[PDB]
Amino acid sequence: MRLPDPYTNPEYPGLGFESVNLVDNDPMIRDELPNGKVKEVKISAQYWGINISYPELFPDEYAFLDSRLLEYKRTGDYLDVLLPQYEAFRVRGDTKSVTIPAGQKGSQIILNTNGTLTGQPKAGDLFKLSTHPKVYKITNFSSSGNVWNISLYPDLFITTTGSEKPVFNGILFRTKLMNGDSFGSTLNNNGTYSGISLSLRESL
Amino acid sequence: MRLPDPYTNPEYPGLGFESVNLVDNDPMIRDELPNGKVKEVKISAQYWGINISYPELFPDEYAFLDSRLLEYKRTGDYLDVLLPQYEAFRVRGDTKSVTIPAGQKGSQIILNTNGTLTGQPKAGDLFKLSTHPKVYKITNFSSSGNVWNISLYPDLFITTTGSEKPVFNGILFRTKLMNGDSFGSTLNNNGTYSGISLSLRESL
Amino acid sequence: MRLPDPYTNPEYPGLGFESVNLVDNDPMIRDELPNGKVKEVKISAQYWGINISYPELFPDEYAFLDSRLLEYKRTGDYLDVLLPQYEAFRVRGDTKSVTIPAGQKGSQIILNTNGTLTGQPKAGDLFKLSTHPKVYKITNFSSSGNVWNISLYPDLFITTTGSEKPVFNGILFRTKLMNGDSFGSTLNNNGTYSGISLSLRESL
Amino acid sequence: RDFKYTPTPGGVVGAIGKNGELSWLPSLTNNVVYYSIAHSGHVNPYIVQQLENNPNERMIQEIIGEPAGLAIFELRAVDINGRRSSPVTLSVDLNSAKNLSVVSN
Amino acid sequence: RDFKYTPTPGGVVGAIGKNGELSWLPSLTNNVVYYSIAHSGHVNPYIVQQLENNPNERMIQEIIGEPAGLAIFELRAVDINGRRSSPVTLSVDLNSAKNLSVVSN
Amino acid sequence: TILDTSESVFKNVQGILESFGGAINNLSGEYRITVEKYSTNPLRINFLDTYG
Amino acid sequence: MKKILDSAKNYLNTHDKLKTACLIALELPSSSGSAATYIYLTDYFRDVTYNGI
């Protein structure tokens, strides 16, 4: 399920994201030895945290947003969040004729584009596999012919089976709405709803 | 009993919500798995919470208000409130001749108007069964002629027994006060009671 | 690896420290005797701490910056930084033909330039040995012809082996991030990432 | 179904020879998590995990460097609860010239 | 040496199905204390200690109760210093522990 | 030793060990039987290597 | 003391960020002793395959 944004629903301009906050949550056990050497240990997973802020909402905008959020809480679905700043179209073509060799469980994807894709991905972009909902950021990219060497920040959450297909454009965050236990919005005497905030967390 | 408001007592326009906060309170056993998956189990019942803020109240209006509140505290019954933003009379007609077939549990509900009601209840509006005092919130609507399919955010607390009648207008929340233990009112030199507010909470 | 900055990437002038805080962190066993005498014992190693604050970063500059930071977090190596206020090239020449006699421990150090270097390193400037990555701070200087006597605030971590070469320019701190666990960036409606800051900490 | 060993006749160096891969269509029954194939030369079985749900869509597992000679393969599907399926057996003799696919269609 | 498996047609040990037996010749290197064998699908490798008389007569270990099908047996030895021989593999198919009568009708 | 098998194997092993002050421990799956002895090759630990 | 591989010591000394994982191999009950099963678990963010398990 997609969170309402002024792409799909421009008739409600108040539903735009006044300010997004992409939080990098990678819990680690960091210990500082007296000999000056700082040591880290990583066990848990990394999850992208998204915080959405909203302006004053008119009754119709709030009605639409609240209906969507209540539909989410009713069906127990997953809110999809689209960040416009990450929607630069660089890689274009078909992602079905590209092959990803299997057995890749590290933090690096080696894929043979088979010359079917034009353009090259840029470092810091958003990358995602077609068979897993986790979202990756490209930290480095070296192309030697048709084989690409894409480096990802989160260690690969799945081991490639050889059937996965890279996804570069149209990437959505399969988030789950936090702070929904006590979710409310105050209606002022002037008819507009205020104090609406969405603390979302990537529940892959 | 009924909480006084300009609809019941028009002679006191000082009564009436300066701002109402309709919060959603669904307790949940949320657990953040190490693999990134978030698992939440719903066990405790959900309850709407209403935070009412009053404007400058003159001495007679506050006398009426706190007289009613103290009668509430004395006889110990429940305190009904009528939110006015949800009082858009979008469904005309008399709902006695509307039958809800028995044996229905969950969010979905099916009711047959038998060609009596005029008007379509859009998403975001309130809904309440005749017998049970719980107040739901319509999230999606779909009708095939006379039969109406309504999806409600909180699951039906009680399974329909075939006699419950829909209540699309004049919905009252059966609430209980949460500020009773220490409830003070300040009188200014201007002659008005300032900062009167209520933290209500739906019971059952 | 190298932290991006306008010297390495002049095309991104948004990178570059709006304000840098170079803190001194020497843990000590301080004890306040009842007679008024204060006794402190140095046991734990000292480490410089660097707090970097960035100005308004545009989306492409932040993409480059967080791509580099996520590559840091991925490959797990150290993150070198170059403080520009200490980049006053006060010592010309090539330091390969400069010998530091072996068997020297403590703050004092003696190095023979053999008539190669031009320029006097005044007090307050940085100093770093070729082999060890520790960064010192010159506190006093005294030269008798070619031989230079330099006093450093932190005692020499390793005793000179007769091959270490002085590094009076281009000194990089081998640091580790301390904000990695929860590192979020907010995007304004103006189109800039605001309040980006780093709490670095020298490792070893 | 369709446990078919698809061999690659590519001329590879003698020291390490890339044996052709093998394919087997996903099990019809849902709630299958991975696929454990026994191997002649390896005690441990190769495992391929089916996270997605793509019926009628083939899957591939490849073996490289195995010695030339007789080979026997036994593949079994595994349930999410822990059940294991019946074995699927296929024995193929490994040789560079013997590396020719079955007649198709 | 001689790491071979000979099936047992009729097998019973304490009234339970007995499969064949697998045998091998002791390593020529001295000071070997036991011969460890790894069995596919089993957490615990089968270990049988040697004997002072082993230098002459090969030892044998029996496998009982396993189902009919493929088994991968890996044999390697140890030294009192921990030194280990290179593993010896034997990929074979096993008969049922107790050949059961077919369904009457 | 007279190992009365009636008693638990735990008790018998403890009784044997208490005779010569030895100790048995299993960490990492190896059963170590060791006694308090002087060694000429200890593991060098420095206070800096230690935590604070 | 339990000695470890030389490569293990080199990796532990050289690498400061260790990505550890605990691989629980728990036994599972069954009515008859002729049936045995195991449930494998780990706290790592992704399933870990060791010895084909």
Side-chain angles (χ1 to χ4, degrees):
Chain A
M1 183 177 177
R2 274 201 51 140
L3 186 68
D5 56 28
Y7 273 28
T8 73
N9 302 106
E11 74 261 5
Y12 311 125
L15 291 195
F17 305 162
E18 201 196 80
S19 296
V20 293
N21 195 28
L22 201 54
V23 173
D24 180 20
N25 291 302
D26 57 345
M28 301 205 198
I29 310 168
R30 177 175 296 102
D31 292 318
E32 293 148 25
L33 301 189
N35 58 66
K37 184 181 285 289
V38 54
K39 315 182 61 53
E40 297 153 333
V41 165
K42 179 175 186 52
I43 308 177
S44 291
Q46 186 277 338
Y47 52 99
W48 293 113
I50 304 166
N51 297 338
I52 312 284
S53 68
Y54 280 111
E56 291 161 345
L57 283 197
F58 279 108
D60 54 305
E61 300 171 354
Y62 175 72
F64 188 67
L65 171 77
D66 186 74
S67 77
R68 295 297 220 96
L69 287 190
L70 289 175
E71 185 59 84
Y72 153 68
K73 296 171 84 164
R74 202 205 93 225
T75 51
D77 291 331
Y78 294 108
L79 288 184
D80 291 331
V81 179
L82 184 134
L83 313 181
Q85 75 263 25
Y86 283 118
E87 276 311 322
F89 302 85
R90 274 73 172 269
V91 176
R92 283 212 208 71
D94 274 353
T95 59
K96 293 166 132 62
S97 51
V98 65
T99 65
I100 302 188
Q104 297 195 140
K105 38 183 173 293
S107 61
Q108 171 181 174
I109 290 294
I110 297 169
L111 62 93
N112 179 33
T113 199
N114 195 9
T116 198
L117 287 168
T118 185
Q120 292 180 5
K122 190 186 272 181
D125 272 22
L126 279 187
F127 163 87
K128 185 171 85 168
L129 296 167
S130 55
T131 80
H132 205 58
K134 183 62 174 66
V135 193
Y136 296 151
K137 308 198 82 166
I138 302 182
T139 71
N140 194 300
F141 166 76
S142 67
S143 171
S144 65
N146 276 344
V147 296
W148 290 1
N149 205 72
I150 303 180
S151 312
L152 321 166
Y153 164 67
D155 303 88
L156 287 165
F157 276 66
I158 55 151
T159 286
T160 48
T161 56
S163 186
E164 301 76 10
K165 296 309 183 192
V167 174
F168 302 99
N169 54 346
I171 293 186
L172 300 160
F173 291 76
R174 185 155 160 262
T175 59
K176 170 158 298 310
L177 169 74
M178 308 274 94
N179 82 16
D181 46 356
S182 177
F183 190 76
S185 54
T186 175
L187 165 60
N188 264 266
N189 48 359
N190 53 19
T192 62
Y193 300 75
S194 183
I196 310 194
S197 180
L198 298 197
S199 307
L200 305 149
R201 176 212 190 281
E202 188 193 9
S203 178
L204 61 84
Chain B
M1 52 179 314
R2 182 51 173 292
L3 180 88
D5 43 8
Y7 296 162
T8 61
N9 301 104
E11 72 267 355
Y12 299 115
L15 305 169
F17 316 150
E18 174 194 330
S19 75
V20 62
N21 186 19
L22 185 67
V23 307
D24 188 359
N25 290 323
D26 52 340
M28 65 184 73
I29 305 191
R30 174 141 50 61
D31 186 74
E32 294 200 85
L33 300 179
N35 59 4
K37 304 178 179 56
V38 173
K39 306 307 179 60
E40 49 194 7
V41 176
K42 302 288 191 67
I43 284 179
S44 166
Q46 195 251 347
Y47 59 99
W48 302 104
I50 307 162
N51 294 323
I52 288 168
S53 192
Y54 274 91
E56 299 285 271
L57 295 173
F58 282 99
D60 193 298
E61 301 145 48
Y62 177 73
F64 193 76
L65 178 58
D66 73 347
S67 88
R68 294 321 300 280
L69 276 176
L70 291 191
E71 169 90 15
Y72 163 76
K73 286 189 179 178
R74 173 193 89 91
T75 182
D77 63 330
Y78 314 103
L79 180 135
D80 301 338
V81 301
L82 179 89
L83 307 196
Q85 69 258 32
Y86 295 121
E87 211 56 39
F89 291 89
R90 276 198 263 274
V91 171
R92 296 291 185 269
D94 199 46
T95 54
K96 315 305 186 258
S97 183
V98 183
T99 186
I100 300 191
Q104 285 178 355
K105 57 182 60 43
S107 58
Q108 303 260 42
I109 195 173
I110 297 179
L111 73 164
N112 193 357
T113 57
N114 299 315
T116 313
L117 267 48
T118 73
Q120 299 294 321
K122 44 194 58 187
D125 283 358
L126 288 180
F127 178 79
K128 174 181 177 165
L129 289 162
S130 56
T131 70
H132 212 265
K134 192 69 188 65
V135 174
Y136 307 100
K137 220 158 185 182
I138 303 170
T139 68
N140 188 18
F141 186 83
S142 184
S143 58
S144 168
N146 313 329
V147 63
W148 290 4
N149 196 309
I150 305 176
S151 58
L152 314 163
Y153 158 56
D155 280 312
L156 282 192
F157 262 60
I158 63 161
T159 73
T160 51
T161 63
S163 60
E164 278 89 44
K165 306 300 179 179
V167 179
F168 286 107
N169 289 318
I171 299 188
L172 314 165
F173 296 78
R174 218 193 71 207
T175 44
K176 295 271 281 186
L177 191 52
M178 302 295 258
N179 282 356
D181 294 8
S182 184
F183 185 87
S185 50
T186 315
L187 179 58
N188 302 142
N189 46 359
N190 294 308
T192 57
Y193 294 87
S194 184
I196 309 289
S197 52
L198 302 173
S199 302
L200 300 165
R201 187 265 191 190
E202 188 180 21
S203 167
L204 183 63
Chain C
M1 52 179 314
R2 182 51 173 292
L3 180 88
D5 43 8
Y7 296 162
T8 61
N9 301 105
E11 72 267 355
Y12 299 115
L15 305 169
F17 316 151
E18 174 194 330
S19 75
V20 61
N21 186 19
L22 185 67
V23 307
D24 188 359
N25 290 323
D26 52 341
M28 64 184 73
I29 305 191
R30 174 141 50 61
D31 186 74
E32 294 200 85
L33 300 179
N35 59 4
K37 304 178 179 56
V38 173
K39 306 307 179 60
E40 48 194 7
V41 175
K42 302 288 191 67
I43 284 179
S44 165
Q46 195 251 346
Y47 59 99
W48 302 104
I50 307 162
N51 294 323
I52 288 168
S53 192
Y54 274 91
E56 299 285 272
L57 295 173
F58 282 99
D60 193 298
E61 301 145 48
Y62 177 73
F64 193 76
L65 178 58
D66 73 347
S67 88
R68 294 321 300 281
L69 276 176
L70 291 191
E71 169 90 15
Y72 163 76
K73 286 189 179 178
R74 173 193 89 91
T75 182
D77 63 330
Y78 314 103
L79 180 135
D80 301 338
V81 301
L82 179 89
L83 307 196
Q85 69 258 32
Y86 295 121
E87 211 56 40
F89 291 89
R90 277 198 263 274
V91 171
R92 296 291 185 269
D94 199 46
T95 54
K96 315 305 186 258
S97 183
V98 183
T99 186
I100 300 191
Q104 286 178 355
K105 57 182 60 43
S107 58
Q108 303 260 42
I109 195 173
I110 297 179
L111 74 164
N112 193 357
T113 57
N114 299 315
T116 313
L117 267 48
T118 73
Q120 299 294 321
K122 44 194 58 187
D125 283 358
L126 288 180
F127 178 79
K128 174 181 177 165
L129 289 162
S130 56
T131 70
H132 212 265
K134 192 69 188 65
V135 174
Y136 307 100
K137 220 158 185 182
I138 303 170
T139 68
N140 188 18
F141 186 83
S142 184
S143 58
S144 168
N146 313 329
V147 63
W148 290 4
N149 196 309
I150 305 176
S151 58
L152 314 163
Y153 158 56
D155 280 312
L156 282 192
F157 262 60
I158 63 161
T159 73
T160 51
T161 63
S163 60
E164 278 89 44
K165 306 300 179 179
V167 179
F168 286 107
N169 289 318
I171 299 188
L172 314 164
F173 296 78
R174 218 193 71 207
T175 44
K176 295 271 281 186
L177 191 52
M178 301 295 258
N179 282 356
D181 294 8
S182 184
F183 185 87
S185 50
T186 315
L187 180 58
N188 302 142
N189 46 359
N190 294 308
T192 57
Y193 294 87
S194 184
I196 309 289
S197 52
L198 302 173
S199 302
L200 300 165
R201 187 265 192 190
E202 188 180 21
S203 167
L204 183 63
Chain D
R1 76 203 163 292
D2 195 24
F3 189 100
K4 184 136 164 172
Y5 168 58
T6 55
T8 52
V12 182
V13 296
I16 295 293
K18 174 194 149 44
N19 319 111
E21 62 273 8
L22 57 86
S23 66
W24 70 106
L25 275 156
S27 179
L28 278 299
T29 183
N30 56 78
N31 299 9
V32 60
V33 293
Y34 63 89
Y35 291 120
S36 185
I37 187 168
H39 188 252
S40 56
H42 294 89
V43 182
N44 45 2
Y46 304 68
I47 291 169
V48 162
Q49 199 280 321
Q50 183 178 2
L51 76 166
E52 85 297 18
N53 300 99
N54 291 355
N56 183 275
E57 201 280 339
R58 307 222 52 168
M59 64 184 73
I60 295 95
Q61 215 286 344
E62 65 95 20
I63 47 159
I64 171 162
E66 309 296 339
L70 183 53
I72 311 99
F73 304 110
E74 173 193 59
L75 186 41
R76 322 191 67 186
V78 293
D79 208 326
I80 185 173
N81 300 356
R83 308 273 155 288
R84 194 179 298 191
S85 87
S86 65
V88 187
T89 56
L90 188 135
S91 172
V92 298
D93 216 349
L94 270 294
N95 174 16
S96 58
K98 181 68 173 66
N99 181 313
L100 294 174
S101 296
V102 182
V103 184
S104 64
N105 213 41
Chain E
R1 280 85 68 203
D2 205 4
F3 184 41
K4 66 178 184 290
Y5 165 69
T6 70
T8 54
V12 170
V13 174
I16 77 170
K18 170 173 69 174
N19 276 323
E21 56 83 15
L22 73 165
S23 44
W24 62 102
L25 185 83
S27 292
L28 204 63
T29 296
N30 201 10
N31 316 322
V32 61
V33 60
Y34 60 70
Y35 293 90
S36 88
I37 281 149
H39 182 200
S40 55
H42 289 210
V43 304
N44 185 2
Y46 300 145
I47 171 168
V48 168
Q49 58 160 1
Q50 79 162 355
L51 200 59
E52 288 268 322
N53 319 325
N54 279 117
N56 293 318
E57 177 52 86
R58 63 200 299 263
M59 74 302 284
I60 308 85
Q61 196 267 329
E62 309 177 355
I63 179 61
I64 78 185
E66 297 302 309
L70 281 181
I72 322 301
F73 275 132
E74 215 54 36
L75 161 58
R76 82 190 79 193
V78 297
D79 282 338
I80 56 170
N81 301 356
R83 205 59 38 92
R84 270 215 315 281
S85 69
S86 79
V88 184
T89 180
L90 183 63
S91 50
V92 297
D93 200 324
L94 273 79
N95 54 3
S96 171
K98 223 158 187 175
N99 270 356
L100 305 180
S101 314
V102 304
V103 189
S104 303
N105 74 338
Chain F
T1 305
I2 304 179
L3 280 162
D4 204 49
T5 46
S6 304
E7 269 85 359
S8 170
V9 175
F10 199 92
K11 301 188 178 42
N12 302 135
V13 165
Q14 176 159 36
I16 282 175
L17 290 176
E18 289 294 312
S19 286
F20 58 94
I24 184 170
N25 287 319
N26 191 28
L27 290 153
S28 85
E30 280 290 312
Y31 272 106
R32 304 281 281 91
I33 315 187
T34 187
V35 70
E36 318 182 10
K37 50 183 277 188
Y38 183 73
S39 161
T40 51
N41 188 18
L43 160 66
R44 325 194 58 224
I45 286 183
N46 190 351
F47 173 69
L48 304 194
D49 306 329
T50 300
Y51 281 67
Chain G
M1 68 83 59
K2 168 97 173 77
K3 89 174 283 286
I4 74 186
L5 272 182
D6 278 314
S7 311
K9 259 168 192 162
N10 269 334
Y11 187 95
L12 292 190
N13 290 304
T14 304
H15 277 49
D16 270 355
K17 183 190 280 196
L18 307 171
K19 306 197 272 196
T20 54
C22 309
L23 315 165
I24 307 192
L26 172 58
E27 206 200 346
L28 207 69
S30 65
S31 160
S32 51
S34 188
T37 313
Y38 278 96
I39 184 173
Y40 311 112
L41 298 148
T42 189
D43 50 11
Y44 204 51
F45 62 84
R46 65 165 183 91
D47 48 354
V48 162
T49 286
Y50 181 75
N51 298 6
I53 306 185

